[PDB]
Ligand SMILES: CC(C)(C)NC(=O)N[C@H](C(=O)N1C[C@H]2[C@@H]([C@H]1C(=O)N[C@H](C=N)C[C@@H]1CCNC1=O)C2(C)C)C(C)(C)C
């Protein structure tokens with residue numbers, strides 16, 4: 001037992017991280033087969049990033065201007081193109097450590113692991129959620145761009161995020177691996193605003209099931225509610241509407257614990273209306289919304305990769 | 306910016322994880338060069354674990370009784386011995402993925418990453434602290450034993466923990482890699498008690514520096530204190546004494562922020578005496594003590610491996 005914010009093992013992704021340098025700018029790239037994927041603002045000076053014309057800056061680069069390094073080994077670049085906000089650098093060597101992989105675009109509310117990197121080298125791994133406003137709460141410094149987020153399923157790495165930029169209050173924004181931003185953001189150093197964030201209701205419920213599985217049961221009340229009445233109450237506390245799709249997804253945890261989802265909603269309703277009264281749940285004084293239902297099952301059942 | 310509970314990249318350790326099976330019991334082992342290290346209770350039946358004589362049970366095992374599997378490949382066992390609570394299984398094949406490594410015994414208050422494994426396969430990675438009562442707050446299920454905790458320094462993996470057992474309230478206990486338990490525990494399924502835990506004062510201060518670095522400054526007051534007066538106040542809140550060694554270790558963060566350690570102690574003193582008044586620090590409603598000073602610098606300066 002015990003319940004921790006757990007990240008995927010990062011070895012498969014570590015074997016794909018490289019360093020990309022164009023002129024004076026160095027960031028991280030992802031090397032899969034014979035292609036290196038990286039953020040397009042590697043081609044920028046600091047001055048360009050205030051208002052870049054990426055197509056124009058790329059036209060004046062040639063293959064040899066991109067210095068790509070896997071550890072202590074330069075990879076020779078033999079073609080290049082831009083896809084949305086990422087560059088694809090074709091190299092003359094296929095990465096022998098390439099995992100089975102997919103590129104996926106995740107949904108708000110879903111979680112993934114981030115391998116933060118600098119100069120092509122891994123610094124650490126942590127778990128994030130795609131917030132409803134399409135930002136993530138990450139930990140990123142200068143040079144971290146090109147770091148990727150991912151999930152693993154058996155042997156298959158699903159890449160879903162590449163890091164590009166930071167927003168007020170330590171908030172981060174990036175693209176999927178086709179270079180399309182999550183959220184209404186562009187890769188330009190100019191004022192842009194995130195939408196209001198909201199709490200991921202289905203993840204709070206998953207985490208309350210994790211608490212019950214761990215023996216933290218004090219918050220279970222004797223009541224049920226309707227889905228409609230729960231959503232009226234949760235709305236003023238800035239919680240996402242709970243849909244029937246969410247209820248079905250919570251099925252395995254509900255069936256395992258013997259606690260109907262709507263009965264857990266009645267307990268959450270009371271927590272939202274009355275507070276915690278100075279108690280904790282799984283050691284936390286705040287309700288937690290960055291564990292999906294699958295995260296809870298994965299951790300409490302010991303799924304491996 | 307941003308501050309997350311960050312684990313070390315686990316790839317180097319993933320390449321060392323194997324499965325060990327003796328009779329009906331399967332757990333994890335660590336394969337370095339031509340030796341597999343694993344917990345000795347792999348040689349137990351469930352009944353033996355109530356009161357095992359490990360020396361006696363080991364005498365009736367021979368090399369061939371240990372089934373060691375690296376992925377889909379059986380490693381042939383060619384010798385065996387017991388060192389304290391771990392077994393060393395000598396195999397006929399050196400692990401070609403062996404990192405540069407060391408075995409170290411960590412101190413209470415220090416942190417490390419855990420790669421939780423089942424059947425020799427990684428499930429997830431998270432960061433833990435060795436509590437002052439020599440337990441850790443982990444996430445471990447049946448079959449997780451042999452999972453290891455570690456730190457990385459440049460290229461060198463320092464292994465410091467191997468998992469053996471669970472204590473009341475989701476608390477975990479294990480050994481260093483010479484098989485010596487942390488704390489007053491034995492590997493026997495019989496009542497044993499942990500000591501009272503206390504809060505790691507120097508880590509709380511490190512985390513408050515991380516908060517300042519991140520712009521969360523509301524708790525800084527205008528006061529200083531003496532080391533003696535701080536420790537009198539912290540004692541009734543079940544905080545560890547802060548020593549001059551701790552103050553020196555906090556030097557880099559103090560010098561970086563321009564906040565004398567004893568000035569930060571005066572701020573912590575006020576938090577302990579007055580509470581948070583409904584505010585958070587780095588998103589948390591509780592003071593956090595599982596980041597060391599080096600963890601803070603590593604994250605906020607982007608150290609890589
Ligand atoms: C106003 C608005 C809300 C839009 N915000 C910003 O302007 N934000 C900027 C930013 O992020 N950038 C400016 C420039 C880069 C991108 C960039 O520097 N990315 C780093 C990659 N290595 C990752 C950063 C570095 C700091 N922490 C990270 O996460 C591009 C092309 C947008 C700054 C101010 C944080 C530098």
Ligand SMILES: CC(C)(C)NC(=O)N[C@H](C(=O)N1C[C@H]2[C@@H]([C@H]1C(=O)N[C@H](C=N)C[C@@H]1CCNC1=O)C2(C)C)C(C)(C)C
Pocket residue numbers: 001332346354445446447448449450451468469470471472473477491492493494495496497498
């Ligand atoms: C009373 C006391 C405080 C001493 N506690 C226990 O008895 N605790 C026991 C326990 O842990 N064990 C009993 C038996 C094993 C060791 C063991 O089952 N280890 C698992 C390795 N794969 C890891 C466990 C499995 C559950 N979660 C883990 O962490 C040995 C030899 C001590 C039980 C009750 C949790 C099973």
